Design a protein around this ligand. Structure first.
Ligand SMILES: OC[C@H]1O[C@@H](O[C@H]2[C@H](O)[C@@H](O)[C@H](O[C@H]3O[C@H](CO)[C@H](O)[C@H](O)[C@H]3O)O[C@@H]2CO)[C@H](O)[C@@H](O)[C@H]1O
Ligand SMILES: [Ca+2]
Length: 642
């Protein structure tokens, strides 16, 4: 039983073998980059899908279609693949898809009788000791996987040969394996609804990454961060309940021959479940005059700053004067330790604030800890939607067992029902959720700029920035929360909770608004700092967060990336580099034939010594244009062409 499937361009092919085990491999341009890798699902009735599998039928199709992708990187995304469905006896199938830039598969339940998934095998067997770039689970102890399942999915990348990885620490997704000769494999998953998230492990075999899933929770207890978390204390002997026919999540091996194709791949959105929303007209992407990063630390005002009405009114004024759409009331507005979103601290009047914000063309987003939000979800959403609140930022889930991934979707739907937008923090990679419910405008699961509030200088944020466009961002949008006006060149960074800075240059921060995808996007710094920086603020306030077209012009993972994005007849280009100074050329052949005006923010000539140093230039340009830009260490540039 040997089945082959090829990508439309013929460069990628997978061979599926049906024997004692069910396996698939991956060949790229003749070279085998994944050796036969076994897949299976073990059920509680002893049935193991994929061992001694009995094929009952097959079907093939060739698909080339455009998938609408609102509130994202393009108006629509191309879905172009050869598909193979293997139908087995006992009412289960496995679907394979071959794209030019990846192989993906998923199990499908067509059984009528409820059951449980005990474990799932999803192995990745490589032919040699390749170099992996992986994000380890940050918390917990080695070998104690239950201590690791409780984590916030925020960490930097460790780069090591497969044989050199920690064999006792889980890695979350996405992660990358360097297959050599410029080929990258990026492993991720999508359509992660009501199913535990997949970790990979180096614990089994040679040159092999194998799966592990958090077990279904048997007993959860309120605790953790300010009594807003539900901690798994006991777990079942299975990982998932299955009560109905369903698709299971896609297992995705992105395969690219150039790093810019990795950053650009659409596979995560393409393989998310289709939108479940008819009316999208009420969803408004945009930016936030954020309170939390900058620690409410305004200067030049006549009131004491903090979680109080005059402070939020100042953020609202600032947002409004600059056309910024939203103000978040972050953690602090609800009475601490009560986990009760109906108990407002005495220094705050939500009604006053929501109404004041409304009279200033500003929407209010309320922050909520997981348990406070989940416990009376529908009533909370109704009550605040009625008050005029536009959405929620929900955080500290720190779980990806089945119960929590079911909660993400349930939360998204409940917010959708009441015309509320949703931002998920203390969560994992998006894995398709923003396609299925487009009102979920951002996701954390990223070691973002908040880390500068407490991180030792050993944390290399500049390096991290040129890793995630190729790794974490492959899964979906990031709430990274950039926009620092305080910028520290190499050696000048220190963690400062109430007056934080970024690592690298001013223009790096500006470039991130193009480089990073964030439909719901922060201005992390104080209004005070922004108002001392008119030029920077104007650029940030004006740039779209949602795009009609996106092109990654060039890049090398962990070194640099240059990205151009279109909105109407306006283009933006952003570039960033690692700690090496770098010279970049921008080929402007993506432009139309009209004559255009460019506005360029580039690193100042002393940006290597003073991170804040920038230069803003104006000049005419057109399609033949080939703009040379110098990037300082930890620097970048931001370009607008109108
Ligand atoms: O990681 C070690 C440091 O953690 C700090 O605690 C942070 C935590 O790291 C962070 O993920 C979390 O961020 C969420 O909540 C915030 C409000 O509380 C914001 O909403 C933020 O956007 C959201 O991602 O905040 C924690 C603090 O609340 C510790 O402060 C630090 O000492 C280190 O232990
Ligand atoms: Ca966080």
């Amino acid at each position: 039983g040997r089945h082959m499937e090829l990508s439309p361009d013929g460069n990628l092919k997978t061979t599926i073998t049906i024997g004692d085990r069910l396996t698939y491999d991956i060949t790229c341009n003749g070279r085998q980059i994944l050796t036969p890798s076994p897949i299976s699902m073990t059920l509680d009735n002893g049935t193991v899908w994929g061992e001694n599998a009995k094929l009952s039928g097959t079907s093939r199709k060739s698909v080339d279609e455009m998938i609408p992708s609102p509130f994202y990187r393009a108006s629509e995304l191309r879905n172009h693949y050869n598909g193979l469905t293997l139908r087995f006896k006992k009412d289960w199938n496995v679907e394979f898809r071959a794209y030019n830039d990846g192989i993906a598969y998923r199990f499908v339940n067509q059984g009528k009788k409820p059951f449980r998934v005990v474990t799932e095998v999803s192995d990745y067997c490589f032919p040699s000791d390749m170099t992996a770039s992986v994000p380890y689970v940050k918390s917990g102890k080695d070998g104690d996987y239950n201590s690791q399942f409780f984590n916030s999915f925020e960490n930097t990348y460790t780069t090591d040969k497969l044989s050199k990885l920690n064999k006792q620490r889980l890695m979350f997704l996405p992660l990358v394996v360097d297959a050599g000769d410029g080929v990258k494999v990026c492993i991720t998953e999508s359509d992660l609804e009501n199913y535990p998230g997949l970790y990979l492990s180096a614990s089994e075999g040679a040159n092999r990454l194998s799966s592990m899933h958090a077990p279904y929770p048997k007993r959860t207890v309120q605790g953790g961060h300010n009594q807003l978390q539900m901690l798994v204390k006991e777990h079942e002997d299975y990982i998932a309940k299955v009560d109905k026919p369903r698709n299971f999540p896609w297992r995705i091996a992105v395969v690219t021959t150039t790093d810019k194709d990795l950053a650009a791949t659409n596979l995560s959105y393409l393989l998310g479940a289709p939108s479940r929303m008819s009316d999208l007209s009420w969803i408004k992407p945009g930016k936030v005059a954020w309170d939390w990063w900058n620690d409410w630390n305004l200067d030049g005002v006549d009131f004491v700053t903090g979680v109080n009405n005059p402070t939020y009114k100042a953020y609202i004024d600032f947002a409004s004067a600059n056309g910024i759409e939203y103000v978040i009331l972050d953690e602090g507005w609800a009475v601490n330790l009560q986990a009760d979103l109906m108990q407002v601290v005495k220094e705050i009047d939500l009604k006053e604030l929501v109404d004041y914000a409304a009279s200033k063309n500003v929407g209010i987003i309320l922050w909520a800890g997981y348990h406070a939000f989940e416990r009376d979800m529908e009533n909370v959403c109704r009550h605040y939607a009625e008050m005029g609140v536009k959405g929620f930022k929900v955080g500290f889930m720190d779980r990806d067992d089945q119960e929590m991934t079911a909660f993400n979707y349930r939360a998204a739907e409940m917010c959708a029902k009441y015309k509320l937008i949703l931002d998920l923090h203390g969560t994992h990679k998006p894995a398709g959720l923003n396609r299925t419910y487009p009102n979920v405008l951002n996701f954390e699961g990223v070691n973002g700029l908040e880390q500068m509030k407490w991180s030792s200088p050993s944390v290399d944020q500049v390096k991290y920035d040129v890793m995630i466009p190729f790794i974490r961002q492959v899964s979906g949008p990031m709430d990274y929360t950039q926009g620092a006006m305080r910028n520290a060149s190499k050696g000048n960074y220190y963690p400062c909770y109430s007056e934080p800075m970024s690592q690298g240059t001013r223009c790096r921060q500006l470039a991130l608004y193009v480089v990073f995808e964030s439909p719901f996007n922060m201005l992390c710094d104080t209004p005070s700092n922004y108002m001392r920086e008119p030029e920077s603020t104007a650029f940030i306030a004006e740039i779209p967060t949602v795009w009609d077209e996106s092109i990654v012009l060039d890049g090398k993972m962990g070194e640099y990336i240059v990205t151009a994005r279109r909105k109407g007849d306006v283009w933006y280009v952003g570039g960033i580099t690692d700690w090496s100074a770098r010279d970049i050329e921008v080929d402007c052949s993506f432009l139309g034939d009209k004559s255009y005006h460019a506005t360029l923010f580039k690193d100042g000539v002393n940006a290597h010594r003073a991170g804040r140093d920038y230069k803003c230039e104006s000049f005419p340009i057109k399609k033949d244009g080939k703009l040379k830009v110098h990037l300082a260490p930890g620097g970048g540039f931001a370009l607008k062409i109108k």
